[model samples]
Target chain A: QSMTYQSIRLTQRPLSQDGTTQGGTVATLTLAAKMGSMGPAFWQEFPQALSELGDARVLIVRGEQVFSAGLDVKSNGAAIVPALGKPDAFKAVVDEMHAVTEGLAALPMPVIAAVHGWCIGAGLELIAGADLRLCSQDARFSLPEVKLGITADLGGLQRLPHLIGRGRTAHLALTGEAIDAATAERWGLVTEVLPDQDALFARAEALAEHLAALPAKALEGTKRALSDGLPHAESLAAAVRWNAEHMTVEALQAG
Target chain B: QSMTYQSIRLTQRPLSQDGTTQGGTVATLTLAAKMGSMGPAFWQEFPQALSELGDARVLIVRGEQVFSAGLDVKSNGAAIVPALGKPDAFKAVVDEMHAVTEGLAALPMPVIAAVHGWCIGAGLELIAGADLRLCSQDARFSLPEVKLGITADLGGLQRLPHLIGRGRTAHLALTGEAIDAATAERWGLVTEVLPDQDALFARAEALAEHLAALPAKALEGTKRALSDGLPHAESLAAAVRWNAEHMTVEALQAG
Candidate 1:
């Protein structure tokens, strides 16, 4: 396995790094990216991270100055364009991208993206796939695929219209222009934008703690309800699966 | 429900009447000819309009000042279509038009529909189904389907509630009167209302670029998740079923 740029850790007692405890839930998977740009290798890490977190909720954060500059297009884009001439090669690349995003979407627990700096292209897609999003005032967002003569193949189109209305999403995707955090917040791309990066991470941690304190079953259920609208039979089956996993002997014995 | 003659023109040039170059956003459906009128025949042009749009993102705007006069009853009602003899006949006509609007909703790319003047009844429904909607300050909107002695059998009833909440949607559907752009924006009907058509188109072009920048799959998927999820009911049901079992004896006894 290649050395991945992203890392995930389940923290039972989250602290502010200076030893101040951030309490509430059982655990939070602190997922961070160490790369300057997200490439195929970075994306390959998501499923493993999700699995490592187990039943814990997630708080996604970025490393240092940048959230992500989306795909390392110089390297990743150059490698993939030749494959575009062939159908199978293109499908293989697309399928890989789908696997990363789909794994993020299918996680049982709630996920929140706390973004700062540049969240572009695939970065925006990652934020879109998360259940909630927060950003710093300095955060910049763009789809930028049109500039590259490609459509955003990630989850941006699939998820953005619901977050912001359709027109704004179209505007962003079509023009490939960058928007500031304030505009992003106004358009519902990010729910809120804090004054700075420190404040943004603080708020994200506070929110994660809040979500963690809630009943696990109810929390996951509410998250699933809002995330996907499955058919009736599938929905019922998911609910049953949830109960079978979380219904404890302690819960029944209390009766 | 006035008697008015109208024509639909598919123009590759997307500019306002003032002759200001609106840039290369390619293809807008120009609805004009007289009184901004749309009757049965005008409504019939939609499938053709969608076809004419081809693979391009569409900008739907009126040629002159008014967006639409909406449902010229004398020439567009049951008297005109001649389905009054049987319920099935009426259903067939409604379904044909429904197929058009549904086709618009199902487009793979985002649509920017800007409106001014009077956007009423089916006009309102058309914009409601669009990916993103903008309007000029002079724009007026209403769902007069009830006033015309029929339900908004088009996508109005189905999509409006999701855009502007149910209470506001109910008010528009019940009362056939027009509301200004400000009111519409306040209720979430239109995302923004520019000063006039020139600005509306300008913004629309900018928005299109933003949308065009993103990957196509992401944009379409985001739209489907929000648009089609409503009818499924499974999204909410999944939560309900999980809660019923998860509220075990211990959790309940604590209360």
Candidate 2:
């Protein structure tokens, strides 16, 4: 059966909305107020929200000015820090976090993070997992784990350099400094900066809707190619192979 | 046993100076005047200079205005063209170049490149192998290999995107265009840009000396983390485990 547009509501987090029109399905994930400081339940429910969307373009946004303050360090830090002495306990939390992040990464559809205000720590790490990211002009970003007496344990340390270059990555992590949205754009951290939060969501939603209308297989293939270093020749080869398999004589005529 | 400051002079190239100050040991690798063209003997003896440093922080600088003009097209091209028909002969030269570049990368301590003037072709490749790079404001860089009817074989294609982004990398590689130091800085190719050649060396030396004073193990670990994409959750776990093992109670107390 073909997938139809639908919406699902979760008690802890904001409801997910799926809209279908002449274009394909686009799923917008609206984060609740509490999602600004993503607690234990936020991570637990996020994967299930993604599952419900199933093969639709994703646009993630939050209600508050803050996108995410990252792990509820006040509450979560107590458990995480104490668990460091016990490898198994720490590993359990780390592994769970990885599963959710990787699950978001492995989604077939393109996922866009429409961020505004503060996107710090775990929040920044989450954006790194996205295929594309847009932020408000007032957005603020930081990886302040070093000041907290711990190396950034999330994928931020590992994955951020891929988005921004090596120099910027170390500068932020070592200094535990915060950068504004313009600086983030200059560093190649975000795709584009909108005028404000209203514009950020509008642009992100429009882009997601536009992407949803494109050939699904082609979009997926393009994302896969760019994720790895597709030095022209390899990309051309992949393109040729992909087209040969997917685009048949009858398929073109039918379209 | 602790490593001591040492200096070794070479007849073929410029002399190496081991200046040990309060900021630790800084090994200045002064490239010979003829190194602007990188002739046969330059590559042969360069690795030997590195070996003599023996774990000291390295600062590479050239005496001339031109950092490197890249492969002597007239002299080296004639020999390389004939060898192309002979696979083993060409492979040998290519393999040797790889060894030298990789040798620079394999240095335990940080390698800094103080570049000025034209850093083209093979010179660009050499800079890619460096951990940190600074350039003079008037410096120009290009990958003119495409104009020579050959792709940049010296790891520029593979590694440059990590330094810059994919969009800019393709723009340079495809068009074989040159970019100035300011543009290079904007593109994230070089770490910083100084006013002139005098300032370039002064700033690079100071930066090298500063880096030398920081905990050597920590610097090395950070470099290791940046080089290989700390892929994802796996890299995060690996990084945590590493810091735990290395940054121990005794290690912290000893310092």
Candidate 3:
């Protein structure tokens, strides 16, 4: 079959100059670039990434400052030394982060942020958009936009109060205070705080990779059922049937 | 700037010269006095402090035991303390502390405790009334009313829930446990835990000095916003507007 999307999962790499290699999926990718970033393009880089049912079942948007600043905003806000016309800077950065974050949320696969250090402003907004956040003890957090004379319009104003209590969330958002890492963890701003960045990322990757390797047809059905079950009150059986139908086609077509 | 309601911040100093200052603010009263063996007249110290707010936002309510042991609640149905002699010593102390805290809350300044050794019974009620708390690590925090077969009436029932969460308030009230500095910090009960007695006053004094240095208007608005914003949503919008109102006042007053 001719390929539509170029996706690869590296199961092995040469370890020593002696031509020895260690093999087992240590790194994974659905395409040339990470899930969210287009690498300066609007079109898909890995259409075939999801072409197969048994392949990586999901994609995640990753990294700090990965997406184009204004890709979602009207003008791409680049940092220029000139004092004038920096109008789009904040909007561009915020909009891109929002779109990427929202896009991931809409996808069937769960998206998580393994964050450390200065998860503030737009950074915080993005993670709040993710399904989960696993952080570290030293992770600094804030909602600084209030002081900037604007509000967190995305899901923040709606979702944060639900995540933390309405009182605590209002306090945090309105005052623009930075709560300590431990307090943030206790408040469930992030589910858990890991020891370090490497460990955080490793755990996240393991979780995502596990999902990637699952039977795509079943996993997709489960994903749909789980997502649609809450608000729509849709029966799990109906969600499962619909999701399974699409996934089965994708799988059989690959073979 | 003749006088508005008073605004006082505590100052912290090192008990020993080697002790680094961890500052806080204190109230300055136009009339400050100590009630030594004077008895029931002690409560006058509280209302007087409230009236003197024009000079200092916070007024130290010092008594013979360096502030009364709080009100005596040992009586089953009704009892009186030898000092306060109000028959309902227990209820009296709670009422006094409530009045004091309500006074503190009404004003736009913070009251910090420079508590030494023991702050229990009615004294603790007053401390609980405070918006910002500071004490030495050695200083103990307790509410002995439960042991006396009486529940803390005053604002404790309402305030404690907001200060810490319901979990902690429940534990402290139900178990009648005395929480130490480490425990208090863990629960976000008090801001700093100094080493010893001398440091308590020293730290408090230093804090007072720091508050004294800030623009009075800024400090006032900040305290108001924080307290009102953290505990309830009914006041969130008004508190945000208060912050805005302070912008101009801050410039004028600071200059």
Candidate 4:
């Protein structure tokens, strides 16, 4: 794995070092160039970082330049293209990606995504599970998996409709369209959009800090209650099985 | 048990009359006259009407002047007021109300709310589950249960965040303040706002009729998928798995 993805865990080091004043209260996880793209390294290490956030009450997720250039198709596509012909291999990659995203959402603390530039494909998928999202005005979001001759094989299909309705989700997924920050905010995809990346990160950290200071259990209860009340789980299993059998080499060759 | 509440089911008869032509039709559950207030009779009959939707592909809910008069305070407040401190009686009232609202959401057909006047307290609770909502400019929405020294027990706290994010839900739940149609629209609480009650109903009917004529199975499936959000690993696998089965070689090449 490249050192780039290693930096996902790198953000945790500074917080641990500053334990006395701020370690446990808040942690800012940078989805920067180091932990940058949702490549093989990111898939492996992202969950490791999420697992280490034991005492942090709130997490602020930010990115450098673009939040992520979606899936690293240029560098990573070689390994994945062959896997499409092998069901078990394909499912393995799907499982690994799923685990990391699940890890981010399973954290007890609230997760706030502070995104900038192009938040595409896997980038959008990662933040869709977050508790809150803030973006820079320069942010542009898209799910172009369909245009690349593949479905968005992430929670983006399942979770995005929660933030934006089914109609908009369909438009984004089917048309492979990109929406600007203003549209995203109006669609409730992001709560706020700062003028620039620095402002976006600062506001997210401040908001997370405020949330961290509140009565911890009060929020956990509220979060649990809302999540528990949602309707079905079988849909996930169905989607998993369906992908294993159908996503073939023919589909991959088109890209 | 009064005639007023039974009128809720009254809106169903008109649409059902043309069953042969518009068999899979649109039904309007009107909360008018005696059914205007969410009293005991309204609670009993509302679920019954929902169950009897039969072939109705869509349901448009509206009320007299206002969308709903909320709990019938004048006629039935005594029983609820006295039962507040007693956990058992309090539980009974809440459970009954929750069941009715749940029934509305559980219906396979899509539900659209057309609001004209006040949509407060229990009224807000009922509509929070709707798939789509439109209101008149005169609509006033509030969840003042906190001010009345009660938490919103009927799933409003659990459900409102799905339409509007948690911060806005907290504002409505905690502050117990009312907001105008424009505010609700801005908050993503209501999708569109008309000028008056008739216009609200007209637009809702037009939308419902349009939705009702489409593939009912697709409508239900889409509605079901959106409400039943999945976890990360499962969500990703499902998406991948779904693509495998649905995206054929030809389809991939075409894209």
User: What are the per-residue Cα lDDT tens digits for candidate 4 across B1-255?
Assistant: 112344364455244564456555577778864536777777777777776678677888888756776776554555565554455565565556667777887788799988888998889988988999899999999876543334455667667877886545654654456889998999888999999888888899889877865656556656665665667676667656555555556644654
Candidate 3 structure quality by residue, lDDT tens digits, A105-166: 45555556666555665456556655667776667777644443334444454445446543
Model 4 TM-score (B-chain only)? 0.83
Estimated TM-score for each candidate: 0.74, 0.69, 0.53, 0.58
**Candidate 3 docking: what grade?**
incorrect
Q: After superposition, how far is residue A125 of candidate 4 from its true place, in Å?
A: 0.9
Error of 2 at A179 (Å): 4.8
* Candidate 1 lDDT over residue span B1-255, tens digit each: 111234677666432335655433345676664666766666677667666555454445554667776667776665435887579887777777776678778876677788878887767887777877888998888888786578787788878876766787888888777789998876667767899889987887777665554444444544444454533333223222222222222322221
Taking the candidates in order, what DockQ does each have?
A: 0.11, 0.17, 0.04, 0.08
Candidate 4, superposed: residue stretches over 4 Å from native: A1-5, A9-24, A74-82, A213-218, A221-255, B1-93, B99-123, B129-153, B157-180, B186-188, B191-255
In terms of docking quality, model 2 is: incorrect
Put down candidate 2 lDDT per residue, A70-152, tens digits, no spaces.
77665555445555556666677666666667677777778888889988877887888888889998899997654444556
Comparing 1 and 2 by lDDT, which wins?
A: 2
Q: What is the lDDT of residue B243 in candidate 3?
A: 33
- CA error at residue A5 for candidate 4, angstroms: 7.4
Candidate 1 deviant stretches above 4 angstroms: A1-35, A55-57, A165-168, A232-255, B1-6, B9-25, B44-60, B63-65, B78-81, B95-111, B129-131, B161-171, B174-179, B186-188, B201-255
* Winning model by lDDT: 4
Q: Which candidate tops TM-score? A: 1
Model 2 per-residue lDDT tens digits across residues B144-227? 999989888888887788878778889889999999998998888886899999999888777765555455655555556666
CA lDDT, candidate 2, residue B181: 93
| TM-score of B-chain for each predicted structure, in order | 0.77, 0.83, 0.69, 0.83
In candidate 1, what are the lDDT values of residues A203-255, reduced to their tens digit? 88788877765566766776786665577788888877877787877756654
